[PDB]
Design a protein around this ligand. Structure first.
Ligand SMILES: CNC(=O)O[C@H]1CCC[C@@H]1[C@]1(C2CCN(CC3CN(c4ccc(S(=O)(=O)c5ccncc5)cc4)C3)CC2)CN(C)Cc2ccccc21
Length: 481
């Protein structure tokens, strides 16, 4: 329930008031996920979902404040409103799950109980709604509009488990999926939501099969296993400032930025590489004085991935590659994309890994080709004369070819092939020839750029890629084989 220490910080008439609430709750032994998710959901609703202030609705009020170029109206999170919704949730879950009927062997939650709570959330949801709809992540959505996005279901199951007093059930995240972790050592996995559009219902099942499959979706087992603090972080990263496709709520941007700096300072993003990248993106738009540069943050994310996740994550490098791409840094962007490909090389492409495929596809056949086309125009009155770029480009295609190896479905098709030739061509033979494609001569040590191919496809083409004249026939045929 809501304790006196929580209720005294209400009402929340500003961003700074909401941050105070989070700061307090993060200090608590067990931060209340339900309360924090409801508050965020409440403010997001009026700052992005429906910005029109209600004319008839009493008891609901707005707080005027000076804006940095007139006035801004913030939704006042009243204790009456937030507690009413909090009460509705706890009522709904407690009045559906009979704890007496389940034996809590030394506090450890049984698989049967986990599945029950998972079913309560699942069966409460609307029969038909657009699953990729924005602002349907928070518990405010589950209560007010009974709609939740894919990862939102998993967050709710964890929030609901917490309400029931089950302090061992936690959120488990990958880079494109969410599930639950529980057990006496927290080694029992349970699917509690769906993935993609029409890929069957694996709910209630274990994650073991996807981990063994070497699929990017279950990150070969080196996925995030949240604590209550990392769950709060997820919640903050889940803030959606999008009003529409081209505009954003400044208050929700300013709110997500402040909450992430708070989380950072208590060291709660040290195991969340994608959060460091999100904070970096926000620091790029409106940098807060005193705080580190976006590049410091982009690399803190990469550092986190290498330290706590065996350097098996893709987005930390994508976040950096995007920043350099935005800043037209070409070599640095192509370096970062080549690093991304080195990670995906020891993964196998499975049907459910479609999101990361679409990402590599856009960079290989749209983003990189545009950067090189732009680079070519700027030459006529530099990165196309740098041999390191051409090495990075080839290392990028090396990782993708290596990824395809051992995969049940092919990655590279004739569509990838055309853009390889085009991109190779953007570099003059003289520049291409400077890159030495060496397999190595002596293993270890005793007491122009150099590149080694890991993939068979790229190895078989080493001589073709470096030739003065490009044989489109052979290069296309070898990449697609
Ligand atoms: C923010 N951290 C986080 O955990 O946000 C959670 C919170 C709620 C769900 C959400 C998420 C994430 C969202 C972030 N993307 C990562 C972002 C970073 N990208 C990114 C992709 C490509 C490039 S590029 O360089 O190739 C490029 C640049 C320019 N033009 C073309 C291409 C640059 C940047 C996407 C990851 C998923 C949502 N998701 C649907 C389910 C989910 C599931 C588990 C964990 C998190 C999440």
């Amino acid at each position: 329930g809501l304790k006196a220490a929580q209720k005294t910080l209400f009402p929340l008439r500003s961003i700074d008031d909401v941050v105070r609430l989070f700061a307090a709750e993060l200090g608590r032994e067990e931060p209340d996920l339900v309360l924090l998710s409801l508050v965020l959901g409440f403010v997001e609703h009026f700052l992005a979902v429906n910005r029109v202030i209600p004319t008839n609705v009493p008891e609901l009020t707005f707080q005027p404040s000076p804006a940095p170029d007139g006035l801004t109206y913030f939704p006042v999170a009243d204790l009456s409103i937030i507690a009413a919704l909090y009460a509705r949730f706890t009522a709904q879950i407690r009045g559906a799950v009979d704890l007496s009927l389940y034996p809590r062997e030394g506090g450890v939650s049984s698989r049967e109980l986990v599945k029950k709570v998972s079913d309560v959330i699942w069966n409460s949801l609307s029969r038909s709604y657009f699953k990729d709809r924005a602002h349907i992540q928070s518990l405010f959505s589950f209560i007010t509009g009974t709609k939740l996005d894919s990862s939102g279901v998993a967050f709710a199951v964890v929030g609901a488990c917490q309400a029931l007093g089950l302090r061992d059930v936690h959120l488990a995240l990958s880079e494109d999926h969410a599930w639950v972790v529980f057990g006496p050592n927290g080694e029992q996995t349970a699917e509690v939501t769906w993935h993609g559009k029409g890929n069957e219902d694996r709910r209630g099942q274990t994650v073991n099969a996807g981990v063994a499959e070497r699929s990017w979706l279950y990150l070969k087992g080196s996925y995030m296993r949240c604590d209550r603090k990392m769950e709060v972080a997820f919640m903050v990263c889940a803030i959606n400032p999008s009003i529409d496709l081209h505009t954003d709520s400044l208050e929700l941007l300013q709110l997500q930025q402040k909450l992430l700096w708070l989380l950072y300072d208590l060291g709660h993003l040290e195991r969340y590489p994608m959060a460091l990248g999100n904070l970096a993106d926000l620091e790029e738009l409106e940098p807060t004085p005193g705080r580190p540069d976006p590049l410091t943050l982009y690399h803190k994310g990469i550092a986190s991935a290498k330290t706590y996740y065996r350097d098996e994550h893709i987005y930390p490098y994508m976040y950096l590659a995007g920043y350099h791409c935005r800043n037209r840094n070409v070599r640095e962007a192509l370096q970062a994309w080549a690093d991304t490909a080195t990670v995906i090389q020891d993964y196998n492409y499975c049907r459910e890994d479609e999101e990361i495929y679409k990402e590599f596809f856009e960079v290989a056949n749209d983003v990189i080709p545009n950067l090189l086309k732009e680079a070519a125009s700027l030459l006529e009155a530099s990165a196309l004369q740098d041999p390191e770029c051409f090495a990075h480009l080839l290392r990028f295609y090396d990782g993708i070819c290596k990824w395809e190896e051992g995969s049940p479905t092919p990655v590279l098709h004739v569509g990838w092939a055309t853009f390889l030739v085009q991109s190779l061509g953007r570099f003059e033979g003289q520049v291409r020839q400077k890159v030495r494609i060496v397999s190595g001569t002596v293993a270890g040590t005793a007491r122009g750029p150099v590149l080694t191919f890991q993939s068979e496809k790229m190895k078989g083409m080493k001589e073709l890629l470096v030739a003065t004249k490009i044989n489109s026939s052979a290069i296309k045929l070898q990449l697609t084989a």
